[PDB]
Ligand binder design. Structure first.
Ligand SMILES: [Zn+2]
Ligand SMILES: [Zn+2]
Lengths: 199, 199
DNA sequence: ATTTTCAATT
DNA sequence: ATTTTCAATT
């Protein structure tokens, strides 16, 4: 019986949208970013505060003049709020529909954050391939330089995130047989990007 | 602090979604429902760690067996979970953008729920009143019979609720100049229903 | 004083 | 199997 903590508002994420994004369909222009924080204890992962939530890529607000090209940047401002202790190592993983992105501030701020805080491990799950202009391959190399942690989402991860972020009673998440074929096609691109290391 | 505790899941709704729902436009579905429970203690209001929450129409899916049901029905099942005791008095207030609603089971169950638990005070707030001509008049009369408590929320309540569910720090809510005109409309519409009592 | 959005089948 | 590619105003 897994369920999300009741300490937060019963604002569960619309399950239809969660499955719609991972419906294995083509089309994503405003998905969401899911992130989690864990505290390591002598090599043992411990979820003390356990911070779990999601962010919207759409950044509207002309009155505030706040804009966010990618939800990853918004989460960076959330790290300071948590005030993580540099003397301790925390495992933070980001779940976004697309992993690669173009933006000096994104990779620049993200790379600087890892360099300023090497005691933090950043894991990013690539559900889709965001290529774009040629700088697409270079963008991953610049980000992968500090975030050399890229992995394709798996069924077990989807079920965990579904029950963790989505609370359904008597209605279990039903997996579709398409991750093996989709992971293979996307996996081919993932290895091709790293192959650029040879030349 | 005024901001909701961060120890709970950040799965809170972003200010863009909250502002979009408060758009107060003409349409249907996507209804937003917010509810709050307070525990009275010897005449002293006391709130638990965090039992606040909200529900929405979300998406549909007949193929998955999804049925169109009012969020109020799901909330009623949440009352039992709280295991409220009749020896204590609890103040539960539901915030709905629209007042009109089909008595599929909310009005019918609500009338029975109040009769089964008269030691519970239920307040109903109608942010907007415009959906039907005959059902709307009857809807208020049916709810008024057991929920003879109808009040409108002011801008101050919106600001408190905005930061309550919105995860914004240092970013005050910017209200639009339209509540004053709407207050007169709702005030005139609300008293219009009571005027039927005179004749 | 009123006006506008999101969303849904085969 | 796929050509999808994170932003916004009023
Ligand atoms: Zn980015
Ligand atoms: Zn109803």
């Amino acid at each position: 019986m897994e369920a999300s903590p009741a300490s937060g508002p019963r604002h569960l994420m619309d399950p239809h949208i969660f499955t719609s994004n991972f419906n294995n369909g083509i089309g994503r222009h405003k998905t969401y970013l899911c992130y989690e924080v864990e505290r390591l204890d002598n090599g043992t992962s411990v979820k003390m505060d356990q911070h779990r939530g999601f962010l919207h890529n759409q950044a509207k607000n002309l009155n505030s003049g706040f804009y966010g090209r990618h939800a990853q940047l918004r989460f960076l401002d959330l790290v300071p709020s948590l005030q993580l202790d540099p003397a301790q190592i925390y495992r933070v993983t980001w779940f976004i529909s697309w992993s690669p992105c173009f933006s000096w501030g994104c990779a620049g701020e993200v790379r600087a954050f890892l360099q300023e805080n090497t005691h933090v491990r950043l894991r990013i799950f690539a559900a889709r391939i965001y290529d774009y202009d040629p700088l697409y391959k270079e963008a991953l190399q610049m980000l992968r330089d500090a975030g050399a942690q890229v992995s394709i989402m798996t069924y077990d991860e989807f079920k965990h995130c579904w029950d963790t972020f989505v609370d359904h009673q008597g209605q279990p998440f039903q997996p579709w047989d398409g991750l093996d074929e989709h992971s293979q096609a996307l996996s081919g691109r993932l290895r091709a990007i790293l192959q650029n290391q040879g030349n």
